Amino acid sequence: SNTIRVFLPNKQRTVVNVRNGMSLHDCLMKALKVRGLQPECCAVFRLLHEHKGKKARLDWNTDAASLIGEELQVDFLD
Questions:
Q1: Which of 37, 32, 8, 27 is nearest to 66 (CA)?
Q2: How many domains in the chain?
């Protein structure tokens, strides 16, 4: 794929495309930028497509191109 979803911590959702020069932070700093959020104070995750009770936690420089074709979330930080 080349698309992934971003669910907000305010329970929202949206779809984003991954380009060259992405990285989680800069790739979500698209998303949240649009939304009016900041990612610096949050933790981003990929959703539990093979887990229960736990989202798959990612890096703020994560290769979203490896989470490509999935659903992501953002939550509180650490």
A1: 27
A2: 1
Q: Residue 3: beta bridge partners?
A: 17
Q: How many residues does the chain have?
A: 78
What's the CATH number where 7 sits? 3.10.20.90
Report how this structure was experimentally obtained: NMR
- Three-state helix/strand/coil letters over 25-55: HHHHHHHHHHHCCCCCCEEEEECCCCCCCCC
Distance CA 32, CA 18 (A): 14
Spatial neighbors of 16 by CB under 8 A, at least 6 apart, are 3, 4, 5, 6, 27, 28, 30, 31
